[PDB]
Design a protein around this ligand. Structure first.
Ligand SMILES: CC(=O)N[C@@H]1[C@@H](O[C@@H]2O[C@H](CO)[C@H](O)[C@H](O)[C@H]2O)[C@@H](O)[C@@H](CO)O[C@@H]1O
Ligand SMILES: [Ca+2]
Ligand SMILES: [Ca+2]
Ligand SMILES: [Ca+2]
Ligand SMILES: [Mn+2]
Length: 1106
């Protein structure tokens, strides 16, 4: 390539001025808001050397009529009139250039459109709007090839672990063309660096063309190439289908430059110096400060009306984790906080889940959790909804060009995407407001699922920023799914933090530059997942690795969760208490994985600092990719080693909320993924002190042991993958107030004792034991007389109706009971041997081997009593008991909560009388049925359907059957046809068909096809040697009827006491009558709904006999 040339500059008709601070001088054109040149400590950076007196308004080239006025020694102002009648532009804008110490600020302070535009109202011509304002062509800062050390360094979005998003370019003549959007961008010489910020929400496309708030351009001027950094275009007045967006969607354009000398004392001026300084001019995502102390992220799940994780239970999880980490901070994402749970009732953000305890319990959760540094988030959706939802309306739904619905997710119900732009223009904000109003303060984060994939239309930079603003404005912190989403505002990205998702192309932001800048502000990065290669092969800064134990994707592994925290997350978060100061790459390595062989340049040393001048140095132990040392690091704090390879002894001087700890509370964590002794040098403030070590368990600090200090050092030879904590004085564990708010103490058996129960019988027969998932359970076995455990139920309301259940898994034929005595009345419920495996995937006690009760299975099901308090609640008792038996009964989780069911002879309390279920006041699940094994252990596709006329009912979008038969609730099964298996069943503990007694079972039902579903009668444990069922196949309810059909069956209780009834998915094929896809799922061909179940004991007379 030949030495390049361009026009020289004739500034003969230009009148320049200057504005300046004490350190930075800027020469500016009086004709146009352009900076010719910057000067600092006698060094120079050019700006836009070649005048370019145009802008672009709605992509029309405009020569503005400009008037100048210097305001003070640092500030100038420009009024800029904009006229183009051919394109209906008639407006003006005021711009200010202002120097502030070493920063240059560019602000459009004011915009007037002389065309009539009312935000919120119709406009007849969208071209009358002032939509876009572009100052491309006027570089805010640049560097010339004639200057020593001239380079440009910029970041683009990359989520592929193999591909860096960063460009590093020498500015030379000649050099390759450059016209490209960037997220972050820096120019420098050997003397000065500059960085540029803009609030432009410009996009040039997806992927690495998105989040392109800056634009870098090479321009050739005389005999030099210049690389300048411009703000990309800004957005202003916008509409959707003629409706102008709200005023809050308009943000005044703004950009800033910062110019610096060597800022990390490495005696070199480069992009890093600019990145350090850039932190003083950049946007900071709201709530970023909290991130560094949220060490324990996870999800607590509810789904399909089951209430797997009530709000108050979640607080017990928080307390376990508080103990096991010794006060590390926590972030719990409540997936299914609303409606019937996860993927129910979307868009009605304020509809907090009633069956998990509603808003009252949620508030109590948030409040009590503060002291444990536990922040709560919720999973919401702004892209799709279901007919059940209050906000399902035809006007909001997304249609395809041909008029068809753009169908969304299908699982419990078939959803339909919404038009996000339409939603924004029609009151979206108010939904967030309703939630804030209802819930009050203290919620940390909103996690908006799905947004960023285009289901709802445009989900790009502009729309994401508007959305994020709606949420931030209520006081909430923003979180997103995708690695590539909400770059301006997100603090957390699910697909970055859960390393397992998506594979090497869909992880966090693979940009040295971007992580240097914002590592401490968010979890959006590439963590350690060797199989993805490149940046994911042991990043020196770690990167959040998220695991779960409260039901998300069937995850239940508590211990794994805790060992993961210490293995990845403690050091990850440690670094987030500092800002990166220096970043050193080593030599390119070759790697092979995921089908390619490729070059990767790894980071070898990263330094960080804090406001107290503490210095952290992280060093990779080798640059040889095939050496074990490539995946090892040393970390030093002010010169002292705190990690080396597989082990670390890290100080931690922050309580759970991140507050500086008092001196007597400073501590150190030890963790080592290997066996073997490690030896460590203590800091001077520990070296002459006694030192005690504790092993951290779910019981807190254990196994106190004073350590021997020899020559300022300690030596630790302890269990691998086991956390320990070190103090300079003897520590104790506090009272946790287990299950506070839940009317009983320690409902989940996490307190390590039973002393708070009053035990009748041989107490040696009752023990706390661990499931195969290390879930602590009450076990009663080997007992020759009745054994009982009793507590008062405390803090109840007088004259109030209640439900209480206990999870029970009975391996004995012995009666196992739950009994409530209110002081004026006694009620009891029992089970003999359990006969139904648990198949609720988000429930902690499902039958998956790794969280099985015993013998690789779980029959846990909730066993209920229904009672009503009197005038006096001082002496209400709850009793768990077991009659004599050799085998074991396991009990876990006692939940007492308000319920207005009227199931027994039209009365609430457990008693005699006809059993009715209208599904209008279910406590949780699908009682008296429990989900069967038709889909195995799963987010079961049977739930309680909620009514919304007309959208859930016959006729709407051609729907064939009603979601809801009477009242507001029915029992619905979605598309579970042709499975030859049991969908759900009763169980003796929920309803017992007494030996030899005869019952009439009646219900109303809807069914989309003939003989897809059948009412069945069985006994004992069902097996698909398959079990005998009395089978009654059921016809469709709509071809020859306008409403649900009524069915009636006689059932006689087997002598074994273990008769049950249910619904079975036949092997017959369904009939979608020519419909397919979304239409077919929506309209209900493959559906079954039950309502108004009744079971009456009867004596066979007259015609009942025939
Ligand atoms: C990974 C993730 O967040 N995926 C979202 C989907 O999640 C699934 O939800 C179903 C129940 O509806 C089930 O629990 C699966 O285990 C879970 O992965 C889902 O919420 C959809 C809705 O559009 O969005 C994401 O893909
Ligand atoms: Ca430097
Ligand atoms: Ca438990
Ligand atoms: Ca009903
Ligand atoms: Mn539903």
């Amino acid at each position: 390539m030949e030495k390049e040339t361009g026009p020289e500059v004739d500034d003969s008709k230009v009148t320049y001025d200057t504005i300046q601070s004490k350190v930075l001088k800027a020469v500016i054109d009086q004709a146009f808001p352009r900076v010719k040149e910057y000067s600092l400590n006698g060094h120079t950076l050019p700006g836009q050397v070649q005048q370019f007196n145009q802008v672009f308004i709605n992509n029309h080239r405009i020569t503005p009529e400009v008037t100048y006025k210097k305001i003070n020694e640092t500030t100038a102002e420009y009024l800029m009139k904009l006229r183009d009648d051919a394109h209906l532009i008639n407006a003006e804008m005021t711009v200010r250039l202002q120097v502030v110490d070493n920063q240059l600020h560019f602000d459009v302070t004011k915009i007037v459109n002389h065309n009539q535009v009312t935000p919120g109202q119709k406009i007849d011509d969208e071209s009358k709007l002032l939509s876009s304002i572009s100052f491309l062509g006027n570089a805010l800062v640049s560097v010339s090839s004639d200057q020593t050390g001239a380079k440009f360094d910029g970041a683009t979005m990359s989520n592929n672990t193999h591909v860096s998003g960063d460009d590093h370019i020498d500015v030379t003549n000649p050099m390759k063309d450059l016209a490209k959007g960037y997220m972050y961008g820096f120019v420098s010489t050997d003397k000065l660096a500059a960085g540029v910020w803009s609030n432009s929400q410009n996009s040039y496309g997806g992927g690495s063309n998105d989040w392109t708030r800056l634009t870098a351009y090479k321009e050739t001027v005389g005999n030099a190439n210049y690389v300048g950094i411009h703000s990309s275009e800004w957005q202003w007045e916008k509409a959707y289908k003629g409706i102008v967006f709200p005023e809050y969607t308009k943000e005044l354009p703004s950009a800033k430059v910062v110019i610096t000398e060597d800022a990390n004392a490495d005696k070199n001026v480069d992009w890093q110096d600019g990145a350090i300084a850039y932190r003083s001019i950049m946007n900071n995502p709201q709530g970023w400060e909290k991130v560094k102390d949220i060490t324990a992220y996870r999800i607590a799940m509810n789904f399909g009306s089951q209430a797997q994780n009530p709000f108050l239970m979640t607080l017990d999880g928080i307390k376990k984790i508080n103990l096991h980490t010794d006060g590390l901070g926590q972030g719990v994402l409540l997936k299914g906080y609303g409606s019937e749970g996860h993927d129910s009732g979307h868009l009605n953000y304020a509809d907090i889940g009633k069956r998990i305890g509603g808003v009252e319990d949620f508030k109590t959760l948030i409040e009590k959790a503060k002291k444990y540094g536990a922040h709560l988030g919720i999973h919401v959706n702004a892209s799709e909804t279901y007919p059940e939802s209050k906000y399902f309306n035809e006007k909001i739904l997304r249609k395809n060009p041909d008029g068809s619905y753009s169908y969304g997710w299908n699982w419990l119900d078939q959803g339909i995407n919404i038009d996000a732009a339409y939603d924004l223009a029609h009151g979206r904000l108010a939904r967030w407001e309703d939630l804030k109003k209802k819930l009050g303060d203290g919620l940390d984060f909103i996690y908006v699922d799905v947004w960023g994939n285009g289901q709802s239309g445009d989900n790009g930079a502009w729309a994401t920023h508007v959305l994020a603003k709606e949420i931030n404005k209520q006081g909430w912190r923003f979180a997103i799914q995708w690695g590539h989403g909400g770059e301006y505002d997100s603090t957390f990205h699910h697909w970055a933090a859960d390393l397992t998702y998506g594979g090497y192309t869909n992880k966090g932001i693979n940009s040295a530059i971007t992580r240097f800048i914002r590592n401490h502000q968010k979890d959006a990065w590439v963590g350690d997942y060797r199989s993805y290669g490149g940046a994911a092969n042991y990043p020196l800064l770690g990167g959040y690795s998220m695991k779960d134990f409260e039901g998300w994707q069937g995850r239940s592994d508590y211990n794994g969760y805790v060992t993961n925290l210490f293995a990845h997350d403690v050091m990850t978060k440690y670094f987030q208490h500092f800002t990166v100061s220096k970043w050193e790459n080593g030599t390119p390595v070759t790697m092979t994985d995921n089908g390619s062989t490729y070059k990767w340049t790894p980071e070898m040393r990263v330094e960080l600092v804090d406001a107290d001048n503490n210095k952290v140095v992280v060093t990779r132990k080798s640059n040889d990719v095939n050496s074990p040392q490539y995946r090892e690091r040393t970390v030093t704090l002010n010169g002292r080693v705190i990690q080396d390879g597989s082990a670390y002894l890290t100080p931690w001087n922050w309580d759970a909320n991140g507050k500086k700890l008092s001196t007597d509370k400073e501590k150190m964590y030890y963790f080592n993924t290997q066996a073997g002794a490690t030896t460590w040098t203590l800091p001077s403030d520990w070296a002459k002190s006694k030192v005690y070590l504790y092993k951290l368990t779910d019981q807190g600090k254990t196994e106190e042991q004073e350590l021997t200090v020899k020559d300022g050092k300690i030596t630790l030879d302890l269990l691998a993958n086991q956390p320990y904590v070190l103090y300079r004085s003897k520590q104790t564990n506090p009272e946790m107030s287990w299950s506070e708010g839940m009317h009983i103490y320690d409902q989940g058996f996490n307190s390590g004792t039973l002393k708070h129960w009053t035990i009748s019988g041989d107490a040696s027969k009752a023990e706390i034991v661990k499931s195969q998932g290390a879930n602590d359970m009450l076990r009663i076995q080997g007992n020759k007389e009745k054994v009982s455990l009793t507590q008062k139920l405390t803090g109840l309301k007088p004259n109030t109706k209640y439900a209480v259940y206990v999870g029970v898994d009975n391996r004995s034929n012995a009666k196992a009971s739950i009994t409530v005595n209110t002081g004026e009345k006694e009620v009891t419920t029992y089970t003999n041997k359990s006969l139904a495996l648990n198949y609720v995937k988000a429930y902690a006690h499902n039958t998956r081997r790794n969280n099985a009760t015993v013998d690789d299975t779980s029959y846990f099901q909730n066993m209920y009593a229904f009672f009503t308090t009197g005038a006096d609640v001082s002496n209400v008792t709850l009793t768990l008991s077991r009659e004599a038996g050799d085998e074991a009964t396991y009990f876990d989780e006692i939940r007492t909560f308000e319920n207005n069911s009227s199931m027994y002879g039209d009365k609430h309390d457990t008693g005699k009388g006809t059993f009715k279920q209208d599904f209008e006041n279910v406590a949780q699940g699908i009682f008296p049925f429990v989900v069967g094994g038709v889909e195995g252990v799963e987010d079961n596709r049977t739930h309680l359907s909620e009514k919304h006329d007309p959208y859930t009912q016959r006729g709407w979008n051609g729907k064939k059957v009603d979601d809801v038969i009477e009242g507001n609730w029915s029992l619905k099964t979605n598309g579970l046809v042709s499975r030859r298996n049991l969908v759900y069943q009763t169980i003796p503990q929920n309803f017992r068909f007494e030996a030899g007694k005869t019952y009439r079972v009646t219900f109303e039902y809807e069914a989309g096809s003939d003989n897809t579903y059948a009412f069945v009668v069985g006994k004992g444990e069902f097996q698909s040697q398959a079990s005998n069922l009395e089978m009654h196949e059921l016809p469709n309810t709509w071809t020859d009827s306008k409403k649900a059909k009524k069915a009636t069956f006689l059932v006689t209780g087997a002598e074994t006491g273990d008769t049950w009834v249910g619904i079975y998915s036949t092997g017959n094929a369904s009939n979608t009558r020519g419909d397919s896809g979304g239409n077919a799922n929506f309209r209900g061909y493959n559906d079954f709904m039950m309502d108004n179940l009744q079971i009456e004991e009867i004596t066979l007379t007259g015609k009942m006999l025939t």
